[PDB]
Amino acid sequence: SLGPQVAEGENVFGVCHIFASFNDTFVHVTDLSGKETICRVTGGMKVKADRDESSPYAAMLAAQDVAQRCKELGITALHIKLRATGGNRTKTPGPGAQSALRALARSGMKIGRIEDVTPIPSDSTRRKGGRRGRRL
RNA sequence: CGGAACUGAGGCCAUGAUUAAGAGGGACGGCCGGGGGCAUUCGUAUUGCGCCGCUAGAGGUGAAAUUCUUGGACCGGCGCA
């Protein structure tokens, strides 16, 4: 975890893959390639209370603690690939998503170019429910 | 000289055929259209597999457990199905 680059003239980039689901939050640091990882760490290690791991309070706290540890490793710049569950399923990030986001706003990492990358299908397989739907 | 069938060539008849339906059928001209059938091409995602990377949780709920998981899960990359 040592970028030999000089600090400001140019950045040694990593790339954080921020998964924000409605029941989990991943954080997966990698190289420019992506194939090689530096540090991945999740919330579920840091907080053990099933009901409020995806809670926005939990996802924020998680994002701060995780981003803190990656900064700790000393990577100055990051590419970003925020991602949600996707597919035939939901296209909206869950309640953790946004608390994590604001948390990473205060956390301090130098940010390269951002992009969205949730895998939307052209034409999809059937959603997990009835025809009559998740009813309640 | 009268009355039935058959058979030749005339003269004349203003010589003979109602219109073409804001009824209809059929033809023609270039169009029009997720109209039909057959064959052909493409896309991602998907779930599955194989391989590589870090790793201890992952799942899922209003809240939890059976469930998968240090015999390497989930996450990421490349190929295949």
Curated annotation (Swiss-Prot):
Residue numbers carrying Phosphothreonine: T118
Residue spans of biased composition, Basic residues class: 127-136
One CC-aspect GO term: cytoplasm
InterPro entries, sorted: Ribosomal_uS11, Ribosomal_uS11_CS, Ribosomal_uS11_sf
TM regions (residue ranges): none
Keywords: Cytoplasm, Isopeptide bond, Nucleus, Phosphoprotein, Ribonucleoprotein, Ribosomal protein, Ubl conjugation
SUPFAM superfamilies referenced in this protein's UniProt entry, alphabetically: Translational machinery components (SSF53137)
GO biological process terms held by the UniProt record: translation
Family label: Belongs to the universal ribosomal protein uS11 family.
Function: Component of the small ribosomal subunit. The ribosome is a large ribonucleoprotein complex responsible for the synthesis of proteins in the cell. Part of the small subunit (SSU) processome, first precursor of the small eukaryotic ribosomal subunit. During the assembly of the SSU processome in the nucleolus, many ribosome biogenesis factors, an RNA chaperone and ribosomal proteins associate with the nascent pre-rRNA and work in concert to generate RNA folding, modifications, rearrangements and cleavage as well as targeted degradation of pre-ribosomal RNA by the RNA exosome.
Name recorded for this polypeptide: Small ribosomal subunit protein uS11
Species per Swiss-Prot/TrEMBL record: Oryctolagus cuniculus
Gene: RPS14
